[PDB]
Design a protein around this motif. Structure first.
Motif, PDB file in Angstrom:
ATOM      1  N   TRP A   1       0.812  -1.206   0.000  1.00  0.00           N
ATOM      2  CA  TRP A   1       0.000   0.000   0.000  1.00  0.00           C
ATOM      3  C   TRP A   1       0.853   1.266   0.000  1.00  0.00           C
ATOM      4  CZ3 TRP A   1      -4.567   1.946  -1.315  1.00  0.00           C
ATOM      5  CH2 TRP A   1      -5.536   1.018  -1.710  1.00  0.00           C
TER       6      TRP A   1
ATOM      7  N   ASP B   1     -11.747   6.755   1.913  1.00  0.00           N
ATOM      8  CA  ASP B   1     -12.294   7.440   3.085  1.00  0.00           C
ATOM      9  C   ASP B   1     -11.257   8.476   3.458  1.00  0.00           C
ATOM     10  OD1 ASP B   1     -14.140   7.939   5.362  1.00  0.00           O
ATOM     11  OD2 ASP B   1     -12.644   6.910   6.616  1.00  0.00           O
TER      12      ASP B   1
ATOM     13  N   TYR C   1      -4.565   2.562   2.983  1.00  0.00           N
ATOM     14  CA  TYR C   1      -4.701   1.129   3.248  1.00  0.00           C
ATOM     15  C   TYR C   1      -6.160   0.709   3.047  1.00  0.00           C
ATOM     16  CZ  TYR C   1      -6.012   2.983   7.935  1.00  0.00           C
ATOM     17  OH  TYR C   1      -6.563   3.644   8.999  1.00  0.00           O
ATOM     18  N   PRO C   2      -6.458  -0.596   2.829  1.00  0.00           N
ATOM     19  CA  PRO C   2      -7.859  -0.987   2.640  1.00  0.00           C
ATOM     20  C   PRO C   2      -8.585  -0.841   3.958  1.00  0.00           C
ATOM     21  CG  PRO C   2      -6.352  -2.751   1.950  1.00  0.00           C
ATOM     22  CD  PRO C   2      -5.572  -1.775   2.782  1.00  0.00           C
ATOM     23  N   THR C   3      -9.843  -0.411   3.875  1.00  0.00           N
ATOM     24  CA  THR C   3     -10.715  -0.169   5.018  1.00  0.00           C
ATOM     25  C   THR C   3     -11.013  -1.451   5.797  1.00  0.00           C
ATOM     26  OG1 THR C   3     -11.686   1.494   3.621  1.00  0.00           O
ATOM     27  CG2 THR C   3     -12.867   0.958   5.624  1.00  0.00           C
ATOM     28  N   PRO C   4     -10.764  -1.453   7.129  1.00  0.00           N
ATOM     29  CA  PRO C   4     -11.124  -2.636   7.932  1.00  0.00           C
ATOM     30  C   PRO C   4     -12.624  -2.891   7.852  1.00  0.00           C
ATOM     31  CG  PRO C   4      -9.757  -1.115   9.201  1.00  0.00           C
ATOM     32  CD  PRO C   4     -10.177  -0.391   7.970  1.00  0.00           C
ATOM     33  N   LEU C   5     -13.033  -4.156   7.963  1.00  0.00           N
ATOM     34  CA  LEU C   5     -14.457  -4.498   7.907  1.00  0.00           C
ATOM     35  C   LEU C   5     -15.245  -3.813   9.029  1.00  0.00           C
ATOM     36  CD1 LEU C   5     -14.047  -8.068   6.557  1.00  0.00           C
ATOM     37  CD2 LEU C   5     -15.568  -6.359   5.525  1.00  0.00           C
ATOM     38  N   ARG C   6     -14.649  -3.732  10.229  1.00  0.00           N
ATOM     39  CA  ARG C   6     -15.255  -3.043  11.354  1.00  0.00           C
ATOM     40  C   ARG C   6     -15.710  -1.631  10.931  1.00  0.00           C
ATOM     41  NH1 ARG C   6     -18.326  -1.815  14.019  1.00  0.00           N
ATOM     42  NH2 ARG C   6     -18.451  -1.299  16.249  1.00  0.00           N
ATOM     43  N   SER C   7     -14.876  -0.913  10.136  1.00  0.00           N
ATOM     44  CA  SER C   7     -15.184   0.432   9.645  1.00  0.00           C
ATOM     45  C   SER C   7     -16.324   0.358   8.639  1.00  0.00           C
ATOM     46  CB  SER C   7     -13.961   1.075   8.994  1.00  0.00           C
ATOM     47  OG  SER C   7     -12.872   1.328   9.868  1.00  0.00           O
ATOM     48  N   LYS C   8     -16.271  -0.629   7.720  1.00  0.00           N
ATOM     49  CA  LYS C   8     -17.302  -0.810   6.691  1.00  0.00           C
ATOM     50  C   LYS C   8     -18.729  -0.945   7.275  1.00  0.00           C
ATOM     51  CE  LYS C   8     -14.458  -2.771   2.871  1.00  0.00           C
ATOM     52  NZ  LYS C   8     -14.483  -3.842   1.839  1.00  0.00           N
TER      53      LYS C   8
ATOM     54  N   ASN D   1     -13.989   1.285   0.105  1.00  0.00           N
ATOM     55  CA  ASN D   1     -13.056   0.148   0.241  1.00  0.00           C
ATOM     56  C   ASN D   1     -11.616   0.516   0.652  1.00  0.00           C
ATOM     57  OD1 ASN D   1     -15.106  -1.618  -0.227  1.00  0.00           O
ATOM     58  ND2 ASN D   1     -14.467  -2.111  -2.337  1.00  0.00           N
ATOM     59  N   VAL D   2     -11.176   1.734   0.309  1.00  0.00           N
ATOM     60  CA  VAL D   2      -9.861   2.286   0.639  1.00  0.00           C
ATOM     61  C   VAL D   2     -10.027   3.375   1.703  1.00  0.00           C
ATOM     62  CG1 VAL D   2      -7.754   3.359  -0.310  1.00  0.00           C
ATOM     63  CG2 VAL D   2      -9.048   1.713  -1.686  1.00  0.00           C
ATOM     64  N   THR D   3      -9.019   3.498   2.571  1.00  0.00           N
ATOM     65  CA  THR D   3      -8.981   4.471   3.649  1.00  0.00           C
ATOM     66  C   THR D   3      -7.693   5.238   3.567  1.00  0.00           C
ATOM     67  OG1 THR D   3     -10.567   3.489   5.111  1.00  0.00           O
ATOM     68  CG2 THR D   3      -8.748   4.635   6.172  1.00  0.00           C
TER      69      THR D   3
END
Ligand SMILES: *[C@@H]1O[C@H](CO)[C@@H](O)[C@H](O)[C@H]1NC(C)=O
Ligand SMILES: *[C@@H]1O[C@H](CO)[C@@H](O)[C@H](O)[C@H]1NC(C)=O
Ligand SMILES: *[C@@H]1O[C@H](CO)[C@@H](O)[C@H](O)[C@H]1NC(C)=O
Ligand SMILES: *[C@@H]1O[C@H](CO)[C@@H](O)[C@H](O)[C@H]1NC(C)=O
Ligand SMILES: *[C@@H]1O[C@H](CO)[C@@H](O)[C@H](O)[C@H]1NC(C)=O
Lengths: 289, 109, 88
Positions: B27, B93, C33-40, C48-50
């Motif tokens: 990343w 985000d 970094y990819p968004t954690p599922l907890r955040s989703k 999907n990305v953070t």
């Protein structure tokens, strides 16, 4: 530094995880920053952050069980310049008494929430230039009359993009000094009424990109310098450069509009040290001009 | 300036099995130059860059099961090119802090 | 190749001898970094990305007037703080 449940470092309090169900009573009044992330807060209690005369930043992010923001919550905070209400999928209502007198507010972020209406800002009365940034709130469908009056005595930036707006009432921007207004990515938005900019300075910057807006209003654009109307296919007719006198840059949809801006058009002293309309799309491959 | 493809470890959370699985991926991370404008003109160039994905790809990994809940599939994005640019609010985000790439609701490394 | 830290520098345009204008500029740490599922689970609009980001901004300043009539800020302190104009 150490608090009962919230993590602490240099008057900065982060209240994280499921164990956080209510805003702690034992939070130090000297606190500079207060964060509420991943909590199982159902409601942020009436007058919760009142008394923290030092507090300058508040963060309410990733709370899946938060439903309402009570009256008098954002009151008695002379040092607060920043509030961030982020990722609150079940937050549907904000009491029109939630945002009280915040004289040093500079930034209000309301992103990715379920709120059915815009926040009531007439009681903020900030002394600072304010950036009201409201995005990814698909349940916001309408900007009612006098929506931003009393937010600031200073000029204001209004980012109302990516919501679910389809209706904009006349004088929605009355008693406001509009610097920048972004209404992009509100796809159901079909029209800008003529008295939209009634009793409002500017805006200097306007973004109606990816909207079904058919036409611009006859007045209010006398101060417009930058117009962004990318994928704004319903436009097709633009006002004459006699009405857009201040316009100096324009990123549109139809190249025909650019041709009309070409061929037609000092101060004492990257930076614009102070010549014609910077228009796009500008292709020569097909014209027609 | 110093925005580049860094190796990271991410958490894939199987909520039903009450655990996460660690996956090393690629990343973005680093530093970008910013300027806070001194003259606050409405037509001023108020623009800030962040270190973020320039291009990405999706990768599917087989996430294990446990008991009564079978092994599933999970698709995650991988950075392919990093740049100091605008944060794409359409896909990303755009925030100050997130929960962390390796965030798990049941543990840590 | 390197990235100098967010600090006070002299503004070339508004600065004048005896009366310089100080501006916050420099580098700050930003990541993705990819968004954690907890955040989703908390996101009504899925992302999907953070991106975690900080920007070089004035911690404090003083409003001044130069070159006949220009209301400019003379930055007194700098820090890497919240990014307001980094999104699309
Ligand atoms: C416009 O705003 C002013 C206050 O700034 C208020 O007195 C007036 O009633 C408003 N006009 C309309 C049309 O609502
Ligand atoms: C990342 O990890 C891979 C595999 O371990 C390695 O080949 C590569 O050199 C590492 N460094 C970067 C900057 O990707
Ligand atoms: C990959 O992940 C493991 C943990 O599973 C970690 O110990 C290691 O540093 C990572 N990199 C490589 C090249 O194995
Ligand atoms: C800006 O601040 C510096 C340091 O405080 C001071 O020397 C200078 O006179 C100030 N500039 C103006 C134009 O007031
Ligand atoms: C986002 O991720 C989910 C699975 O984690 C998937 O449904 C979706 O297609 C991904 N891609 C985009 C572009 O949202």
């Amino acid at each position: 530094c150490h608090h009962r449940i919230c993590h602490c470092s240099n008057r900065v309090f982060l209240c994280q995880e499921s164990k956080v169900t209510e805003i702690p009573s034992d939070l130090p009044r000297n606190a500079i920053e207060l964060r509420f992330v991943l909590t199982k807060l159902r409601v942020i209690q009436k007058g919760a952050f009142s008394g923290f005369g030092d507090l300058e930043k508040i963060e309410i992010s990733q709370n899946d069980v938060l439903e309402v923001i009570e009256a008098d919550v954002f009151s008695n905070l002379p040092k607060l310049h920043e509030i961030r209400i982020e990722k609150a999928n079940n937050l549907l209502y904000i009491n029109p008494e939630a945002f009280q007198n915040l004289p040093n507010l500079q930034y209000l972020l309301i992103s990715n929430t379920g709120i059915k209406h815009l926040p009531d800002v007439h009681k903020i009365h900030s002394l600072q230039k304010v950036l009201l940034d409201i995005q990814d709130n698909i349940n916001i469908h309408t900007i009612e009359r006098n929506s931003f009056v009393g937010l600031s005595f200073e000029s204001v930036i209004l980012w109302l993009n990516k919501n679910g707006i389809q209706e904009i009432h006349n004088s929605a921007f009355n008693g406001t000094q509009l610097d920048e207004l972004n209404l992009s990515d509100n796809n159901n938005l079909e029209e800008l009424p003529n008295d939209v900019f009634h009793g409002a300075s500017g805006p200097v910057i306007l973004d109606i990109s990816r909207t079904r807006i058919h036409s611009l209003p006859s007045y209010g654009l006398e101060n417009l310098k930058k117009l962004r109307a990318r994928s704004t296919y319903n436009l097709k007719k633009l006002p004459t450069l006699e009405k857009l006198v201040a316009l100096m840059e324009a990123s549109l949809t139809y190249p025909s509009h650019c041709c009309a801006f070409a061929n037609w058009r000092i101060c004492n002293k990257d930076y614009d040290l102070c010549v014609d309309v910077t228009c796009s799309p500008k292709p020569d491959a097909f014209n027609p001009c | 300036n110093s925005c580049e493809l860094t190796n990271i470890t991410i958490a894939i959370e199987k909520e039903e099995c009450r655990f996460c699985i660690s996956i090393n991926t690629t990343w973005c991370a680093g530093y970008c130059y910013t300027r806070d404008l001194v003259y606050k003109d409405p037509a001023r160039p108020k623009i800030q860059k962040t270190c973020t994905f320039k291009e990405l790809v999706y990768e599917t990994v087989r996430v294990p099961g446990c008991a009564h809940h079978a092994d599933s599939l999970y698709t995650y994005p991988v950075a392919t090119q990093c740049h100091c640019g605008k944060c794409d609010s359409d896909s990303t985000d755009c925030t100050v802090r997130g929960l962390g790439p390796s965030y798990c609701s049941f543990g840590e490394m | 190749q390197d990235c100098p830290e967010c600090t006070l520098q002299e503004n070339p345009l508004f600065s004048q001898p005896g009366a310089p204008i100080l501006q916050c500029m420099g580098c700050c740490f930003s990541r993705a970094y990819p968004t954690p599922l907890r955040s989703k689970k908390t996101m009504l609009v899925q992302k999907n990305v953070t991106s975690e980001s900080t920007c070089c901004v004035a911690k404090s300043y003083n409003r001044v007037t130069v070159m006949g009539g220009f209301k400019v800020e003379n930055h007194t302190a700098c820090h890497c703080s919240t990014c307001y104009y980094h999104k699309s």
